[PDB]
Design a protein around this nucleic acid. Structure first.
Ligand code: K
Ligand code: K
Ligand code: K
Ligand code: MG
Ligand code: MG
Ligand code: MG
Ligand code: MG
Ligand code: MG
Ligand code: MG
Ligand code: MG
Ligand code: MG
Ligand code: MG
Ligand code: MG
Ligand code: MG
Ligand code: MG
Ligand code: MG
Ligand code: MG
Ligand code: MG
Ligand code: MG
Ligand code: MG
Ligand code: MG
Ligand code: MG
Ligand code: MG
Ligand code: MG
Ligand code: MG
Ligand code: MG
Ligand code: MG
Ligand code: MG
Ligand code: MG
Ligand code: MG
Ligand code: ZN
Lengths: 125, 60, 206, 80, 98, 127, 24, 155
RNA sequence: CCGGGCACUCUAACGGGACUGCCCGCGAAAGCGGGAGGAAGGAGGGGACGACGUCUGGUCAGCAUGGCCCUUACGGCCUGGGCGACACACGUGCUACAAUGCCCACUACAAAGCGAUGCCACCCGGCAACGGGGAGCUAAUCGCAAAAAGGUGGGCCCAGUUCGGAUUGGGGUCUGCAACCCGACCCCAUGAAGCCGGAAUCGCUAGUAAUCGCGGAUCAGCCAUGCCGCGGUGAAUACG
């Protein structure tokens, strides 16, 4: 079925399949199904035009998802970046924003290593 | 452990989150136990002397 | 840099504590800072008396403070003129109605701390180190004893390069618990720095 | 995922010094060391010189930068 | 119903001293609830042996607080004579609860 | 009437009482197979009986505390054989050859300082 | 894993309680 | 073992076959100390060698093993600077050790998702003469002897 | 839980026990190799103990100390910042890459410790962190406290996945005078690398390794995945 913004989950339990929607996680998946009474264990292929529709409704109206979120999140980052805000600077400089060390591993935020030259003696160990 | 810093005793911190044990015997401020008011070093010394009642060399 | 303290190593055995008394996690530290301050004044004062040990017992605000000395004379004083001053000077520091005995050391030449102080003094007196050591061991080794040993630190005779002189007699089986070796350390201030004298006296056995 | 609770902290050093400038129209600049203080509305349209630990940095406070704290606008360290 | 706990650091004194209270009643009181052991509360202290660095040495110290019960059922009025001021220990503490 | 034996292992004690009967065993209440649910081990604890071809002649009331279910299984193994001996001392002669009469002294070795856990030592780099 | 804040083990390992690991 | 000659520890007989060779294999199947988990895998696999075969597992086991025991292997040595693979026999104790290990290793290399299946399926292919456990074995032997030119270095 | 019993378990004081003592074989002895009896057999396990000395090893920043040196300051107070920086490189670790595994239910078995202005049962509000109210402890008597791995049942079906939880938006709770720099902890959303690691290299010989969880010191809180202990489950191999 196609729930939120052109989302096509399938052949998998609705609860988990629902996860493939942007703003939808293990938590909200559990919710929507219950507050709509739909056995989570049903494969999406085995849903019902009725069930499906009820689901599509709740989800797309009870929350801000997919592309709308993205734009929103990017909006906030953009937002606190337009201020002389420190966090914003980190985003700009591309470094962690939640007070973590950068002397060593801060890769996931920095990306691949851009190695360079240096000294030999004085065991850099 | 400059005398000027062994003023810790103040108890007039202005904000109690500034208080800080600090060994009574060597002024030590980095490894001071509570139950003794002594730092890890001072504790080892007097303990050996036997000037800490009960405190014996633990083994097992 | 090895070897444990002979006393600390033998507390539960041949050697008892210099402070006997129970306390709770709320007073133990206090009954220590004080209990320690007691040794602070007594040491600076009863120096000449030559105080070997300074036991201290406690109870409900009670205090023993048995002071062991070679020459109890200087302690007590004229008839009793001093053992009174230093008891009122004592109880002044700690309002605990504190007793204050004055035991006498039978043969101070079996009192490691004394023997140490002795050697220490002689050193500040520009004496010859090796001699004092050899003498000390003798004096102690002569006053009975089944063994003895003395170790003066370094910077001997103000010699640029620090050394370590010692010499000893009889036995001093530091590894055997069932021994009883009075140990005594004495510092030795000088014009060219400190020196450290150490003394061991193997007295009994089982 | 920031927080604090119920009581939004602000140092009255400049508070009863920022509003005091309002009961007279406005002013120009305010030398402060308290970057611990939370920026609140009665500051909008002002200029607070916060301290790095070396100098005082002018900080024209604006509408959006409210919930934030003075320090967030006074970069401490200096890099390449 | 005389409950008297005995806590100390020395298991010999707090033990002999404890068997002092036991007889000072076996001559004027119930057979008493005998001297009860009660688990010991050990306190450990672990410190780097020397000053500065060498974090792999360390020496272990413990403070063993031994305990006892005694407990004299039958609030014998003639026992408090032998158990009034006839003590001797020096590092022992005593709690009395009826 | 009934016969007793104790039994301890890897720091865990077992109270054992043997009374003539079918072959039922009450371990801490619950039936044996109830307490030792799906632990391929358990079965061993009653070995002292199979030994002297008993089992079908005794009932057993067992108590147990301290340690873990596998430690207990061995503790039970002791009591059973210790009580089974008090009952008939002529039984020792058949139990010894399989040593059920022995107490397993293997116990968690203390952790030393400097070491990550007794023997396991820290890892040193390019020495 | 012992590092997923939202799992039973996550809580245990991190020695905390919450939705994913209630206090009995 | 610089001093004495190390005594091969004796294992506890099987609780379902009173076999030591089983407990041995069970230990090799064992991971992080969890033996219960291990044991199951084995028996559960024995039950699978039960369905798919009229023969009893214990027998399939033995044979599976027996086929994977290498009787020759090549150990190294230094001579003149170059290194030679000296072919030498294989003691009983070691034969067994290499067998059980190899089985489990070959087993867990299999494609079937369920453990007890792989152990069962490897065990079967073993007694049959096929299976990677046996391949590893025949290979060790091909390696050995296939250097008979260096056999004159009796270990 | 009652009665009341100490026998058990245990608690903790004190003793018993192992000595190559007994048996056979070897030897000249010492002492080997075997057997019996025993809980335990030949230092039964594990600790504390580390000789004369060697690195002109380490520490003047624990303390002590000789000698130089500063004294409106190299002494002292404070607010703020920095010890937390980040193109890079290394050590020690943590969590993983999954099915012998991961979830959710429900259930069982430990030891050590810690607990006044502190452990906090129980009840109520909240998804929760946490907040209210509130019994008991002065602690073998109350509390921390669920042990976890395990077991029983169910889900997932080999996918970067119900693996992994980095990073990043949100909204909150706490401690604290105050969490921007620079605190943990909840909850929603994000859901990164990672399919087991080149050359090299580390540990460990038995209740050891491996694995699972529990406590404590320091401490308002905490950046502890550190350290020092604790007990579950429990291997492989050693020709030489
Ligand atoms: K794991
Ligand atoms: K030197
Ligand atoms: K990444
Ligand atoms: Mg999603
Ligand atoms: Mg940083
Ligand atoms: Mg100083
Ligand atoms: Mg503090
Ligand atoms: Mg401190
Ligand atoms: Mg010694
Ligand atoms: Mg506030
Ligand atoms: Mg362990
Ligand atoms: Mg996960
Ligand atoms: Mg298992
Ligand atoms: Mg002989
Ligand atoms: Mg020795
Ligand atoms: Mg040097
Ligand atoms: Mg060096
Ligand atoms: Mg040096
Ligand atoms: Mg640092
Ligand atoms: Mg690991
Ligand atoms: Mg796996
Ligand atoms: Mg609640
Ligand atoms: Mg609620
Ligand atoms: Mg902060
Ligand atoms: Mg995969
Ligand atoms: Mg070894
Ligand atoms: Mg922990
Ligand atoms: Mg803490
Ligand atoms: Mg951190
Ligand atoms: Mg921790
Ligand atoms: Zn100190």
């Amino acid at each position: 079925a196609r729930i939120a913004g052109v989302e096509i989950p399938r052949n998998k339990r609705v609860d988990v399949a629902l996860t493939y929607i942007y703003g939808i996680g293990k938590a909200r998946a559990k919710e929507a199904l219950e507050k709509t009474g739909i056995n989570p264990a049903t494969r999406v292929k085995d849903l019902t035009e009725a069930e499906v529709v009820r689901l599509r409704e709740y989800v797309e109206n009870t929350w801000k998802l997919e592309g709308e979120l993205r734009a929103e999140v990017a909006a906030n980052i953009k937002r606190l970046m337009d201020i002389g805000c420190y966090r914003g600077l980190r985003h700009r400089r591309g470094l962690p924003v939640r007070g973590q060390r950068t002397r060593t591993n801060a890769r996931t935020r920095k990306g691949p290593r851009k190695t360079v030259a240096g000294k030999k003696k004085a065991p850099r160990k | 452990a400059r005398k000027a810093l062994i003023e810790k005793a103040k108890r007039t911190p202005k904000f109690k989150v500034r208080a800080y044990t600090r060994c009574v015997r060597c002024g030590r401020a980095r490894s001071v136990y509570r139950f003794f008011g002594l730092c890890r070093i001072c504790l080892r010394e007097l303990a050996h002397k036997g000037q800490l009642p009960g405190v014996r060399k633990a083994s097992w | 840099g090895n070897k444990i303290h002979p006393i600390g190593f033998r507390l539960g055995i041949t050697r008892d504590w210099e402070s006997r008394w129970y306390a709770g996690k709320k007073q133990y530290r206090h009954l220590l800072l004080e209990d320690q301050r007691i040794r602070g004044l007594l040491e600076k004062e009863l120096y000449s008396a030559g105080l070997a040990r300074v036991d201290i017992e406690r109870a409900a605000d009670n205090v023993a403070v048995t002071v062991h000395v070679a020459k109890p004379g200087v302690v007590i004083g004229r008839g009793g003129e001093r053992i009174r001053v230093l008891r009122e000077e004592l109880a002044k520091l700690t309002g605990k109605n504190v007793a204050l005995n004055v035991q006498e050391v039978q043969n101070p030449n079996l009192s490691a701390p004394l023997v140490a102080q002795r050697v220490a003094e002689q050193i500040e007196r520009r004496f010859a180190v090796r001699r004092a050591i050899k003498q000390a061991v003798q004096r102690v080794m002569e006053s009975g004893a089944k063994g003895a040993k003395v170790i003066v630190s370094g910077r001997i005779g103000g010699a640029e390069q620090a050394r370590t002189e010692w010499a000893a007699q009889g036995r001093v089986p530091l590894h055997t618990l069932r021994a009883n070796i009075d140990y005594g350390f004495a510092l030795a201030r000088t014009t060219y720095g400190v020196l450290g004298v150490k003394a061991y006296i193997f007295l009994g056995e089982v | 995922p920031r927080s604090l609770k119920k009581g939004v902290f602000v140092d009255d050093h400049l508070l009863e010094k920022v509003l005091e400038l309002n009961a007279k129209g406005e002013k120009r600049l305010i030398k402060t060391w308290s970057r611990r203080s939370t920026i609140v509305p009665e500051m909008v349209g002002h200029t607070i010189a916060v301290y790095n630990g070396k100098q005082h940095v002018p900080v024209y406070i604006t509408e959006n930068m409210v919930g934030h704290k003075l320090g967030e606008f006074a970069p401490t360290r200096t890099y390449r | 119903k005389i409950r008297i706990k005995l806590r100390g650091f020395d298991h010999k004194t707090l033990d002999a001293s404890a068997q002092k209270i036991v007889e000072a009643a076996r001559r004027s009181g119930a057979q008493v609830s005998g001297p009860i052991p009660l688990p010991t509360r050990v306190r450990r202290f672990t410190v780097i042996r020397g000053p500065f660095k060498h974090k792999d040495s360390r020496e272990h110290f413990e403070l063993r607080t031994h305990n006892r019960l005694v407990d004299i059922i039958n609030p014998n009025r003639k026992t408090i004579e032998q158990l009034m001021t006839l003590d001797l220990p020096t590092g022992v503490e005593i709690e009395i609860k009826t | 009437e009934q016969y007793y034996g104790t039994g301890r292992r890897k720091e865990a004690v077992a109270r054992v009482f043997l009374r003539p009967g079918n072959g039922k065993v009450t371990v801490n209440g619950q039936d044996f197979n109830e307490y030792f649910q799906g632990l391929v081990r358990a079965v061993a604890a009653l070995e002292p009986l199979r030994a002297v071809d008993a089992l079908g002649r005794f009932d057993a009331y067992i108590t147990v505390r301290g340690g873990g279910k596998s430690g207990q299984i061995d503790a039970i193994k002791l009591g059973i054989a210790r009580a089974l001996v008090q009952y008939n001392p002529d039984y020792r002669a058949k139990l010894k050859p399989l040593g059920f009469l022995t107490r397993d002294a293997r116990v968690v070795e203390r952790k030393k300082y400097g070491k990550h856990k007794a023997r396991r030592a820290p890892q040193y780099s390019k020495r | 894993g012992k590092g997923d804040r939202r799992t039973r083990r996550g809580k245990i390992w991190r020695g905390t309680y919450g939705k994913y690991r209630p206090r009995k | 073992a610089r001093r004495r000659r190390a005594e091969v520890r004796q294992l506890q007989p099987d609780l379902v076959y009173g076999d030591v060779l089983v407990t041995a294999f069970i230990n090799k199947i064992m991971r992080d100390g969890k033996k219960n988990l291990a044991a199951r895998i084995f028996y559960d696999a024995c039950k699978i060698i039960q369905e798919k075969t009229g023969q009893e597992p214990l027998k399939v086991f033995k044979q599976a093993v027996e086929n994977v025991k290498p009787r020759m292997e090549v150990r190294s040595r230094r001579v003149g600077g170059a290194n030679y693979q000296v072919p030498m026999e294989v003691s009983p104790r070691r034969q067994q050790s290499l067998a059980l290990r190899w089985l489990v290793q070959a087993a867990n290399q299999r494609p079937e998702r369920r453990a007890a299946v792989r152990i069962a399926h490897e065990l079967m292919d073993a007694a049959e003469g096929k299976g990677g456990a046996v391949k590893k074995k025949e290979d060790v032997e091909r390696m050995a002897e296939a250097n008979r030119a260096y056999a004159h270095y009796r270990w």
